[PDB]
């Protein structure tokens, strides 16, 4: 790797600078280098890794959606043949998106997940695994589409099982996992009722636990609870 010669601490420092400069591709490359040093990541470092790749893939997904919409309109009746260019360029963006997802999944499988024993690390990484399979599922159309969807489901489900046993209902990672798995149900698995039930039960169980929290923890938990409520409002 091109980051193999840079100190771990320097990679982390530069990831933080890249975040300040909104240079998310750089941030992701620095964090990939840090992961590849082979040591486990701290809570803050896991956040740097996830923020970097979430921003990179989020931009790719937004671009893919723009191009896919143009492509769909081009294939409507009465539209003029514009040639292969829209499909080609959508495919180019799609292939780059798949490459980034494969890279993240590769870091998780070699070897972040297998060395993650605490709930706060293991749930976070398994949630990421579900997220990146979900992004692959958003663009999938081939023989393996059902297996891609099931890979996302399986990762989210393992994260859910651990989170319910090992974290309080207000834990922000537990809440964010539930938020995203609920979106998986709604958008990917054609299961809007499961999506709504999960978001509602998660919200209600968190509400009942807020009384145990400090002011700062309350702010953290209610932030994610509001996202669950926002999705429920969208879906009902």
């Amino acid at each position: 790797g091109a980051m193999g010669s840079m100190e771990r601490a320097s990679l982390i420092q530069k990831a933080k600078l890249a975040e300040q400069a909104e240079r998310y591709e750089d941030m992701a490359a620095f964090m990939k280098g840090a992961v590849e040093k082979g040591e486990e990541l701290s809570n803050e470092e896991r956040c740097l890794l996830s923020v970097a790749y979430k921003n990179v893939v989020g931009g790719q997904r937004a671009a893919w959606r723009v191009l896919s919409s143009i492509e769909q309109k081009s294939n409507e009746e009465g539209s003029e043949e514009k040639g292969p260019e829209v499909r080609e360029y959508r495919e180019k963006v799609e292939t780059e998106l798949q490459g980034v997802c494969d890279t993240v999944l590769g870091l998780l499988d070699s070897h972040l997940i297998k060395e993650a024993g605490d709930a706060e690390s293991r749930v976070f990484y398994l949630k990421m695994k579900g997220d990146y399979y979900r992004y692959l599922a958003e663009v999938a159309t081939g023989d393996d589409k059902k297996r891609i969807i099931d890979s996302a489901r399986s990762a989210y489900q393992e994260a859910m099982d651990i989170s319910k046993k090992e974290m309080p209902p207000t834990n922000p990672i537990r809440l964010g996992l539930a938020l995203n798995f609920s979106v998986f149900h709604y958008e990917i698995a054609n299961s809007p009722e499961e999506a709504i039930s999960l978001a509602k039960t998660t919200f209600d169980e968190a509400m009942a636990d807020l009384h145990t929290l400090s002011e700062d923890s309350y702010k953290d938990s209610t932030l994610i609870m509001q996202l669950l409520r926002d999705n429920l409002t969208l879906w009902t």
């Binding site: 709604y186 996202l227 926002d230």
Partner: peptide
Amino acid sequence: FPATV
């Protein structure tokens, strides 16, 4: 799109 984190 719905919210994810």
